[PDB]
Structure formats: C-alpha cells, structure tokens
Amino acid sequence: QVQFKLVLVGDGGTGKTTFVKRHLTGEFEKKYVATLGVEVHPLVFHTNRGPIKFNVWDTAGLEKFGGLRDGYYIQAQCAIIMFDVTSRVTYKNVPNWHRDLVRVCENIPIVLCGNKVDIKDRKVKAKSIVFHRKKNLQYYDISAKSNYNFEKPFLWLARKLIGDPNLEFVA
Amino acid sequence: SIHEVVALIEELYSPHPKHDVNQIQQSLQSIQKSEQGFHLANELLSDDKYSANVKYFGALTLTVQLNTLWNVFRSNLLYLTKFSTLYVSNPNMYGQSLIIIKKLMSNLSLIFTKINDPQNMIKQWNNPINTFIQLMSVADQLLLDSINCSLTYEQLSQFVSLSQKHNELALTFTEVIVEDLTKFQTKRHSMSQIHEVVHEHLYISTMALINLNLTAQAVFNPTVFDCITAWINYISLTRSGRMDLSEIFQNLIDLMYQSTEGSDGYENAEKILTIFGNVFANDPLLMSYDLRQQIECIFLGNSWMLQYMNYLVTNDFFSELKELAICIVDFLQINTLSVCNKLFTNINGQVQDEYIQEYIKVLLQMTNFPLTPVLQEFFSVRMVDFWLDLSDAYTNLASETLRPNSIELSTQIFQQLINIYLPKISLSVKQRIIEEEGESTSVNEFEDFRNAVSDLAQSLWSILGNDNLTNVLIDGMGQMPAASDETLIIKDTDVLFRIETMCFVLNTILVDMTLSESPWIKNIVDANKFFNQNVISVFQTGFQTSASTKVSQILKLDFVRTSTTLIGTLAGYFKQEPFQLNPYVEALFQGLHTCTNFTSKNEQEKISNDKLEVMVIKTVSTLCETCREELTPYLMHFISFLNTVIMPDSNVSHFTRTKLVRSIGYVVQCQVSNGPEEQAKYILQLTNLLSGSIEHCLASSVQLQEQQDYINCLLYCISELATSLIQPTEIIENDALLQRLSEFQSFWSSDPLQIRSKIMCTIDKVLDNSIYCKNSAFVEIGCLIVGKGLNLPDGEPYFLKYNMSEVMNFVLRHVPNCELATCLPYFVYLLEKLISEFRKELTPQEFDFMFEKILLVYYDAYIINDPDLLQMTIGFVNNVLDVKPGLAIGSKHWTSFILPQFLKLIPSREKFTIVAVAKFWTKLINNKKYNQEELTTVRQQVSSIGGDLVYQIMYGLFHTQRSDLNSYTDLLRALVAKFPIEAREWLVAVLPQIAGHEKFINKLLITRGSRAAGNVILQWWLDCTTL
Ligand SMILES: Nc1nc2c(ncn2[C@@H]2O[C@H](COP(=O)(O)OP(=O)(O)OP(=O)(O)O)[C@@H](O)[C@H]2O)c(=O)[nH]1
Ligand SMILES: [Mg+2]
C-alpha cells in the first residue's frame, strides 16, 4: 500500500474532528471539545491500484491550542482547509490558513471544504467562493452530518497525488 | 539531551514512525517552553549539521514569546542573527533553504508588532528592511544595537540589489510582514496603532523597492508581483492614513502592455492581470479614475488586448482566457451606474454618444464571443451579471430623467441581448461538453449558466415586456408546426434544440406570473394555433427518444424536464381555456404508462425511467393543484388507475403513488357542489384503500426493507391526501361551498364515516409495531398526519381536524416506545402545533402535564448531554413564551427546573445551544406579552438569580470564541437595558471571580444603555484574554 500525509486545518469549530471521526468510524459527534495541538489518524481507502492511506493530521483551530502549529505542516503531502458556511468569519480566515500552509508547502494539493451545508441558514453561497482559480486547489460543499460530498475531497486529492482523474473508490 | 531532541524531531517527520507520533509531538510541545527551550533553538539553528526540518523546528521553537520584557530582546537578537546566517548562505547556493528564512521573517513580523504597541526598555523598531539590510555590510554583538533603528540611504538600498537573491529576500520580507499583519488584522482588531508606523517607514521603502523592480530592467524579479498583491490586500483591509498604490498601478499597466508573445510570452501579462483582477473584484476604487480609464481603453481597444486573446484561443489556453474574462467583467462592472446614466438619462452633445454607443456595441460584441460557452469561453457566462446589473440600474432610474429615446434604445439593446444568449444556452452546447469531457463539472457550470440567463430574462421582462420578449417567444413557437407529422416527434435536431431553449426561457418568464390576473396568456395562445401542439411535441419527442448513448439519456431528461415544467406553469392558462388541457393530460398519462410497463432492466436505464416518471407525476399534480375543477371528468378514471398501481406488485414508484394520491385529492377537494356526503364517499374510499393496504402489508409478511418502504409510501399517501384536502386559503370564484359551509362544518365535526378514527388507528397499528416506532421517518410522517388540521383557519370544515386530547393521547401512546434521540423532536413539534392551536384553552396545569410526560422525565438520561434535544427543549420553552407566557411562568417547574437548568447551559460550547439559551433569557427579559403582574414577578425572579446569571455569561465569554460573542451581547445588553442598577451590583462580584479594564467596561457598558455593546464587550475580551 501507499501512504500520504494530509494536514487538516481551519478555524475552531467548522468540524474537522467530527469530519475525520465520521470517515473513521461513521460516528457523528454532536458536542464540541476543541483539539489540543493535533491528532493523527490513518484513513485507508480501497480502490483500483490497491488501497491508499492518508494519515490525517487534524490540527487545532484555536491558536490557544495550536501546539506545534506550523511544525505539523512539515513533510505534508496534501492539505484540507475547512470553514463553517454558517459562520462567515471562518471563511474570511481561509487565506490565512492557505498562506500558513503554502509558506512551507507551496505546490502541494489543497482541498477547500465548506462544511455544515446541512444547516440551511447558510451565510456563504458557492458563487461567493472564488478560491478555485488554480489547479492545485479545489472547493467542495461537504457536510459531516449529512455525508453530502462525503469522500470527494479525498477523491480529488488521491487523483492528483497519484496522477489519474479516474479512481472512483470501489467499496 | 540535544541529540535525543533532534532524534525525536526527525522521528516526528518520518514517513513510517514507531512510538506514536501523537505522543512524540506532545513531548516536543513539552520542550517549549523550558529552562533550555530558548537555548535549544539557539543550538539547533547555529549548528550546520542539522537538517532543514530540524532547523525549522528550531526556528519554530523560537516563536514561544506567547509563553518578561528583556527575554523579548534576547529572542529578537537571535532572530536577527540566525536570519543573517541563513540569508548570507542563500545567494551562493541554489534553492531549498528559503522556508526557514521565511519563518524567521514571520517571527520578526510578530516582534515588529509587539514592540510598536501600547499597553525604559525600547519602544522603536521602525524599518525592519533597514535593520535587515545593514547586516551584510558587517565589536560583533555591539553592532546589532546600533543597527536596530539605523537609517539606510536609498543608494545603499539599491547597492544591495547587486545580486538577484538579495532583491528576492528584500521583497519577500515586506511581503511576509504585511501578510502576517493581515492575518493579525483578520483575527484581531487592535492594530490601528501599528498601521501608522507601517505607513511611515516600511511603506516608503517598500514602494521604492517595488517601483525600482517595475521600472529598472536587469533588476526586475517576478517575486515583486507576489509582493504587490500582498501590499494590496493589506491596504484593502485597513481602509478601502491613505496608502497610495497609484504609481504602482501605472507602472503595472505599462509593464503589462510591454509584455507580448515575442517579449516574454505574456507571462507578465497574466501576472499583472491576476493583480488587476484581485483589485477589480475586491476593492476596485483603490485604482483611481484616470488609471481605470487607461485600463478601459486597453481592454476594449492591431490592438494589444485582441492580440492577446487570439494568442489564447489559437493555443487553446482556455483557462487563462477564462480568468481574463473574469477580470474584464469585474472591471466593466465598476461603472455600471454611470454607463446606465450616460446611456439612458441626460443628466459634447453626441461625441459622447458616439463613444458610449460604440462602448455598448463592443460589450454586446464581446458577450457574443465566437467560441462555445463554458467549454472554451466564459465571456458570455461571466457577464450575465453585468447585463443584470445594467438592467436593474435602468429599471431603477428616476422616471423624470430618462431621454426621449430611452425605451427604444433599451429595447434594442436588451433584445439583441436575448438574441445573443439563446444560442449560448442551447442544449447542443451541453451535448458537446459531455461529448468532449463527459459528466464533468463543466456541466454543473453550464446549468449555473442557464439559470443565470433565466434570471437575466426575468429581469429583462420589466424592460421588454410581453410585446418585445414573451410574445416573441410564443409567436415564434406557435405559428409553425415543429413536427407537422401526426406522430408529433420533432424530427430535426436543430429545431428541437431551438424550441427547447425557447421553452426554457418562456417557462422562466411565466413563473413570475399568476396567469389569472390577465387574459393576456389566453389571448396570445389563441393567436398561435401550433403552440400547444409544439409543447406536447417537445414532450413526446424528448420522451420517445431512443436513448442510445448516455449523452442522449441526459439530454432526454433535460428535454422532458423543460417541457413538463412548462406544462405545469401553463396550468394557469389551462384554467382559462380548459379544452386544451385534455391533450396534455392524455400525453402525460400515456408517458406514465410507458414508464411503468417499462421493465427492461439495465438497472441504470431504470433510474432514468424513474426520473422521467417522477417528472411526469409532478406535473400532473401541479396541473391538478390549479385545474382541480376542470379535471373533474377524469376523477373516476384517476381513482381506477390508482387502484391498479397502489398495489405493491407494480413497477410504479412510491413517490408517484403519493403524488397520484395528492392529485386525486386535489380533484376531490372541489367536489362540493353536492352535499358533504358525496365528497366523503370519495374520501372514505381512498382512506379505506390506503389503510387496508397498510394493514395487509403488516399482517402478510415479515417487515423487511421492501415492506417498510411500502408502509412509508402509504403513510405519505395519507399525508398527501390530507394536504390536498386543505381548503385553499385564497378566495376563489363561485365558492359554492360558502352556501354549504354550515352543513360541512356540522358533517366533519360529527364524521359519520369515522375517517379520523380509521386514519389514526392505522397510524397506531404502524407505530405500535416495534419495527417502526423506533424509526424517526415513520414517527415524522405520523406526527405530520396528526398535525395537518392544527392551526388552520377557524371555521374551515377540514375533515382531519383532531382535537387536543386526541393529539396528546397519540404522542402519549408513542414516546415511551420510540427511539427518543431521533424521534422526540417530531412529537415535540406536534405538541408545539397543539399549544399554538389551543393557546386560549390551555392552562398551566395542562402545560405542566405535557412538559412532564414528554420532556422532564427524559431530561437526564437522554437530553442533558444531547445538543439537538437540548436545543429542542429550549425552543419549546421559547415557543411557549412567544405564545402564552403564563403557561411557563405559572408552571410548577419554572423556578424549580427551567430557570436553574437554562442557567447552567449558558456557558455551553455548542453554538446553537448558546444561541438558544441566549434567546430564552433575552425573551424572558424583553417579552411584551406580559401583563403587569407577570412582569413584576419576572423581574423579581431575574433579580433573584441575576448574580448567578451574569456569572454564567462572563464565564462563557472568558472561554468562548469571537464568532459566538454576539450571541451573548444581545443577552448581556438586555440586562443593562432593563436592570441597570443591579447590573453593576452583579458585575463587581462576578468579574473578580473569573482588574482596571474590568472596571472600565463596568463604566462604559452601563453608560451606553444598549445597541452599541459588543464593541464595548470585545475590547474587554481582548484585554482579559492575554493576561
Ligand atoms: N449541522 C452540522 N454540524 C456539524 C457538522 N460538522 C460538525 N458539526 C458540529 O460542529 C462542531 C465542530 O466540532 P469539531 O469537529 O471538534 O471542530 P474542530 O474542527 O475539531 O475545531 P477545533 O478542535 O477547535 O480545531 C461539532 O459540535 C459538531 O456537532 C455538519 O456537517 N453539520
Ligand atoms: Mg479538532
């Protein structure tokens, strides 16, 4: 099997830990306990060309709990930035996380994820998002509570990291 | 110990580590800070043998100034020193060693912002560029002291750019500084002090360096571009002192226009276009009018711009052409109001007409851009928004200022506009997209494009009207047979695509209309003999399509979708002219019969079959919603067809079963010309059918997934029947019912046919089965059925109107047996519907009864640690406060349970729980439905728990984040609005439990009264966070 380092960043809340927990166990955490520094978890996906595993570095969004902060980004091979579509202030810090990532890993693939689309009091609309300019960067509406675009940010990553737009993740 | 530190640093960054990287990184966090953590970074950076990751971890460990006043100097000294080491080693090298330099730069930015900050050491560090740049000219440690705020000559500045990497580092350093200042500004609002020292030293030398890079050959370095954008984004957030950028914009224009294919392959062209697009999309007034007009001349014109566009289209650089188009549209969209003024109003007689009509001609000419949309060009795509804004500007002009030719010229322009866009949104375009890319994201962008064009056409209706838009679409579509052959299959693909796009835009225009206020639609369709025939032939052609390829499949779905939605919207016409409805009804049911008896099992053609089927049934139901009186002759047939497909052994879908029942119910609802008994005959037949099918399914087989889905289908059929039998709230011609109102009111109040009892005995049999009562889906549909008759207009003779007891018995029979965490919200929403319906009859004893049985007994083992259910209970109490507050105030659980529990939930960490409890307390304080006794008692009660309450608030803001601060302000503010005297009595005791600045807010929160808190609050939170 092949292994890839993913770093998961974004402001506190937004749902990074619940995202990786839904991918790992199918559980949906309703309560918010902020992470302290990082948590590293393997996620294996099955597909053609054998399985591929992302070891995911769920970082802390609160700077009070940042831990190593930039140190987690070293040797990173892909990144996921995440914001809360119900909290516009989380979307305004997206370029902050983006430059913090690319100042140590500039040409790596990064997926931008608007979480919590299931909440229909949505305050950020997809036409407002413009960070799909470059090719090493992609946007997706996702919801860790609704599984909407569940494992699509990992599909796009995988496709660019191995170099084939056709994997589809067989179960 | 340094060797083992380096060891586990390397092990942190290894691909296959042991010893658990989580514990490794925790141990690394333990090392910083420490007695030697600072010295550790020292020895980690100064030793040459350490690797890049290890040196960068050292640079990171230096960042712990967030862990009294002179160790700041020590760390500053070390940043400068290691900075100089690693930046001298950079020029005589090639690559790989830049990220550690960047980190040292970022930390020097943070130092820069700590020293130059309010709140005999040293106060000044004015120009980090000068400080940085005097340190290659170099008894030793004494230098750094005087080099600190040392002035640099602009000649010696230029001397440093003797090599190219020196220029790179100098530009990158200002870039880093303003990027970190931008990050700090986004998070934190306490830097209006440092923006002036940046304005007054760093700005000048930065503009000098950027301008030298832009004007001097042989020293230019593309990094300047990454620098410029930085300083743009930094200047945009400060204010939209004034930092200029006008000369930089001028030189960027000049450098762009010197970039050609032969000069540098338009590299500088695309870079400066990205910069200008950033400016135009986010802060366009940052560029002055003169420079914007130079840009306007260049964008619109042998001309440079044209020679660039061809360069993009011959080499198929469609992505770069797309981003060019985005930039140009964002530019053009700056002066839409002035263009609208200089065109249509009169506030150089025509030599500015000769200019602006040419302007409009080349904007139309650019919109029509000779390439296929989304697949090649977004010029037509991206400035649907320009034309939308221009039409909105025209329609919003003052009626007394328009030119005499305004109507005519606007009609000409915005009509040639639709002439342009109709071929652009042809399904032939989507066909080609999926032929060359398949079901990519380009088709999602194409759908977005058609929807944007449809919104544009809706906007243009107010300018063009029916005479110059809608009648054009209907006339051009209704004077010739698209398929004169009586097969009614449109045989030519081109006329098919054309008529489909026309149907699409006609639909979009027709939905904004209520086709009953005007006989226009009947008058215009009567003048077009082939209109209905062509609509039906579009439907038939699309739906009899031999879907050979998946391209043809998705296009078939598109054609039938367009045609069916058009039929559904023409329903209003059909009501004005019913003798045209029968062909549509016959075609729809013939196609439905085609769907159902279709048994060919490709398994992926049946998904398309079911999509076609649901489209068909949606449109027959939308026709029945409006034409229910005109469809009476079909009723007996519908009921018969329902009987042949309601059975589970049918190839119909459950959703079509439900929509068919709903449409039948629509037709039954208006059958009031006789007594209520004849209509109740139909209703009894339908309810017996549905309930008997449910009971047969429950008794005949084990309830596997098939049987569960069928039970769900039938419960939704009952719900659709109940919904379709609700009287339409709008008054309709010849009610006839109104002559018979009393005798329906007396009939369904008695319900001799026992419809309500039958229906809820069915629901009970479903939910008394263990398999279903634990299923929130079926709990939901049952609660919906029980709640249809609630909150309807008083006196409406609605058949399924359950009284209060009947409702609660229901919930009382089924909350002990359901899965609470998933099912209880539906019961609680039904109880809220109940208490809204019966608000004037309810007593606090009945409120306590339903609050105890449904919520309080389950609060600890199921609710207290479940955010959804907790927000549910808070919303229930809030709803009772909205409706009839004395029910909760007079409750025996008010002081006992509600106030203490909602008092504890204030420092919750879930944002919606926070906003729910804040809503609770705010409405408790600000409820205007109180009588004076209730108000007195509520003030007594809030005065009793006010100290605990204000503690819980301040306890929350101490630990919560900036996003959920506002949710507390509205709460806290409320207090000082109503209890200003106790407030400080409560503040002086809770603030020391969680010094000067505290008293500050106490003097400035109560002084404000209300409305402008929060601004007073965060300046407190920003104080009491650092410590
Ligand atoms: N409605 C909805 N809520 C969600 C969704 N995803 C997460 N949440 C909620 O949002 C909160 C986010 O919590 P976390 O996942 O721990 O946030 P985080 O990214 O780990 O934040 P930090 O630990 O501070 O870095 C949780 O309480 C979830 O209940 C979602 O997709 N939809
Ligand atoms: Mg987390």
Residue numbers in the entry:
A (entry chain B): 8 to 178
B (entry chain A): 3 to 69, 78 to 129, 137 to 155, 162 to 263, 268 to 328, 343 to 388, 393 to 1039, 1044 to 1076
Reproduce text from the manuscript describing this model:
The best one diffracted to 3 Å. Ran is positioned inside the Pdr6 toroid and, thus, enclosed by Pdr6’s N- and C-terminal arches. Furthermore, RanGTP changes the curvature of the Pdr6 superhelix from a rather open conformation to a closed toroid. The ring closure is not caused by a movement around a single hinge region but instead by subtle changes in the packing of adjacent helices all along the Pdr6 molecule until HEATs 19 and 20 contact the loop between HEATs 4 and 5. Our Pdr6•RanGTP structure is indeed incompatible with Ubc9 binding. There is a partial overlap of the respective binding sites, i.e., RanGTP would clash with a bound Ubc9 molecule.
Furthermore, we found that Pdr6 imports Ubc9, exports eIF5A, and thus, combines functions of Imp13 and Xpo4. Pdr6 is an all α-helical protein built of 19 canonical HEAT repeats followed by three helices (termed HEAT 20) at its very C-terminal region. The transport signals recognized by Pdr6 are folded domains.
